[PDB]
Amino acid sequence: EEWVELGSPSEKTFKQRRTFEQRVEDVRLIREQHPTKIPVIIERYKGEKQLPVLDKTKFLVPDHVNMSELIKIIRRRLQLNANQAFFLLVNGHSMVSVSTPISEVYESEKDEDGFLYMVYASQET
Protein backbone atom coordinates (compact mmCIF):
# COMPACT_ATOMS: atom_id res chain seq x y z
CA GLU A 1 0.00 0.00 0.00
CA GLU A 2 2.89 2.41 0.83
CA TRP A 3 5.37 1.30 -1.79
CA VAL A 4 4.34 0.51 -5.36
CA GLU A 5 5.95 -2.57 -6.88
CA LEU A 6 6.98 -1.88 -10.51
CA GLY A 7 7.51 -4.57 -13.17
CA SER A 8 7.61 -8.30 -12.55
CA PRO A 9 10.12 -9.91 -10.13
CA SER A 10 11.32 -12.57 -12.61
CA GLU A 11 14.16 -11.99 -15.05
CA LYS A 12 12.83 -11.58 -18.57
CA THR A 13 14.26 -13.43 -21.54
CA PHE A 14 15.31 -11.47 -24.65
CA LYS A 15 12.17 -12.54 -26.48
CA GLN A 16 10.13 -11.36 -23.48
CA ARG A 17 11.97 -8.04 -23.21
CA ARG A 18 11.19 -6.98 -26.79
CA THR A 19 8.00 -6.67 -28.81
CA PHE A 20 7.36 -8.96 -31.67
CA GLU A 21 7.71 -6.05 -34.20
CA GLN A 22 10.92 -4.83 -32.47
CA ARG A 23 12.33 -8.32 -32.96
CA VAL A 24 11.20 -8.55 -36.60
CA GLU A 25 12.83 -5.11 -37.16
CA ASP A 26 16.12 -6.18 -35.49
CA VAL A 27 16.32 -9.17 -37.83
CA ARG A 28 15.48 -7.13 -40.90
CA LEU A 29 18.44 -4.85 -40.14
CA ILE A 30 20.76 -7.83 -39.66
CA ARG A 31 19.70 -9.58 -42.86
CA GLU A 32 20.19 -6.24 -44.61
CA GLN A 33 23.70 -5.50 -43.24
CA HIS A 34 25.07 -8.94 -42.37
CA PRO A 35 23.46 -11.13 -45.00
CA THR A 36 25.90 -14.06 -44.59
CA LYS A 37 25.37 -14.21 -40.75
CA ILE A 38 22.64 -15.87 -38.71
CA PRO A 39 21.24 -13.98 -35.73
CA VAL A 40 21.33 -16.24 -32.69
CA ILE A 41 20.05 -15.57 -29.15
CA ILE A 42 21.90 -17.59 -26.50
CA GLU A 43 20.67 -17.88 -22.96
CA ARG A 44 21.32 -19.97 -19.84
CA TYR A 45 18.39 -22.25 -18.88
CA LYS A 46 16.47 -20.72 -15.92
CA GLY A 47 17.25 -23.12 -13.09
CA GLU A 48 20.93 -23.64 -14.06
CA LYS A 49 23.53 -23.55 -11.28
CA GLN A 50 26.63 -25.37 -12.59
CA LEU A 51 27.24 -23.19 -15.63
CA PRO A 52 28.10 -19.52 -15.68
CA VAL A 53 25.99 -16.84 -17.40
CA LEU A 54 27.44 -15.69 -20.71
CA ASP A 55 28.80 -12.18 -20.93
CA LYS A 56 26.36 -11.50 -23.85
CA THR A 57 23.05 -12.79 -25.25
CA LYS A 58 22.99 -11.57 -28.93
CA PHE A 59 25.27 -13.21 -31.47
CA LEU A 60 26.03 -13.25 -35.17
CA VAL A 61 27.14 -16.58 -36.46
CA PRO A 62 28.70 -17.01 -39.91
CA ASP A 63 26.51 -19.24 -42.10
CA HIS A 64 29.27 -21.83 -42.37
CA VAL A 65 29.75 -22.46 -38.64
CA ASN A 66 28.39 -25.80 -37.55
CA MET A 67 26.79 -26.69 -34.23
CA SER A 68 29.78 -28.53 -32.94
CA GLU A 69 32.09 -25.56 -33.58
CA LEU A 70 29.50 -23.30 -31.96
CA ILE A 71 29.33 -25.58 -28.91
CA LYS A 72 33.14 -25.38 -28.59
CA ILE A 73 33.10 -21.60 -28.95
CA ILE A 74 30.50 -21.20 -26.17
CA ARG A 75 32.21 -23.71 -23.87
CA ARG A 76 35.39 -21.58 -24.20
CA ARG A 77 33.63 -18.21 -23.68
CA LEU A 78 32.12 -19.68 -20.52
CA GLN A 79 35.57 -21.06 -19.55
CA LEU A 80 34.27 -24.51 -18.74
CA ASN A 81 36.36 -27.41 -17.45
CA ALA A 82 36.66 -30.14 -20.07
CA ASN A 83 34.77 -32.55 -17.80
CA GLN A 84 31.70 -30.30 -17.39
CA ALA A 85 28.51 -31.52 -19.07
CA PHE A 86 27.02 -28.99 -21.55
CA PHE A 87 24.06 -29.03 -23.92
CA LEU A 88 22.97 -26.37 -26.38
CA LEU A 89 19.27 -26.73 -26.87
CA VAL A 90 17.58 -25.32 -30.00
CA ASN A 91 13.84 -25.20 -29.39
CA GLY A 92 14.37 -27.35 -26.29
CA HIS A 93 16.30 -30.14 -28.01
CA SER A 94 19.93 -30.87 -28.83
CA MET A 95 20.67 -30.92 -32.56
CA VAL A 96 21.54 -34.27 -34.14
CA SER A 97 23.36 -32.79 -37.15
CA VAL A 98 26.38 -31.07 -35.60
CA SER A 99 28.29 -30.79 -38.83
CA THR A 100 25.71 -28.90 -40.94
CA PRO A 101 26.08 -25.16 -41.36
CA ILE A 102 23.95 -23.05 -39.01
CA SER A 103 22.50 -21.36 -42.10
CA GLU A 104 20.75 -24.76 -42.80
CA VAL A 105 19.72 -25.42 -39.21
CA TYR A 106 18.26 -21.92 -39.18
CA GLU A 107 15.80 -22.81 -41.94
CA SER A 108 14.26 -25.63 -39.89
CA GLU A 109 14.52 -24.10 -36.37
CA LYS A 110 14.21 -20.31 -36.63
CA ASP A 111 11.53 -18.57 -34.68
CA GLU A 112 8.58 -16.78 -36.35
CA ASP A 113 10.44 -13.53 -35.51
CA GLY A 114 13.49 -14.55 -37.56
CA PHE A 115 15.84 -15.20 -34.61
CA LEU A 116 17.29 -18.59 -33.80
CA TYR A 117 16.91 -19.22 -30.07
CA MET A 118 19.22 -21.41 -28.03
CA VAL A 119 19.36 -22.30 -24.37
CA TYR A 120 22.30 -24.00 -22.74
CA ALA A 121 22.19 -26.29 -19.63
CA SER A 122 24.15 -29.04 -17.81
CA GLN A 123 21.24 -31.50 -18.29
CA GLU A 124 19.64 -32.40 -21.62
CA THR A 125 16.05 -32.01 -20.28
Interface positions with its own copies (CB under 8 A) = 28, 31-32, 35-36, 63-64, 100-101, 103-104, 107, 114
The C-alpha atoms of residue 7 and residue 11 are separated, in whole angstroms, by 10
Q: Minimum Å distance from CB 117 to its own copies?
A: 16
Residues 66-99 as b or e (16 or more Cβ within 10 Å = b): bbebbbeebbeebebeeeeeebbbbeeeebeeee
Q: Minimum Å distance from CB 21 to its own copies?
A: 16
Q: Minimum Å distance from CB 36 to its own copies?
A: 4
**Complex with its own copies: residue 107 or 124, whichever CB lies closer:** 107
Backbone angles phi, psi at 24, to 5 degrees: -50, -35
**Complex with its own copies: residue 17 or 28, whichever CB lies closer:** 28
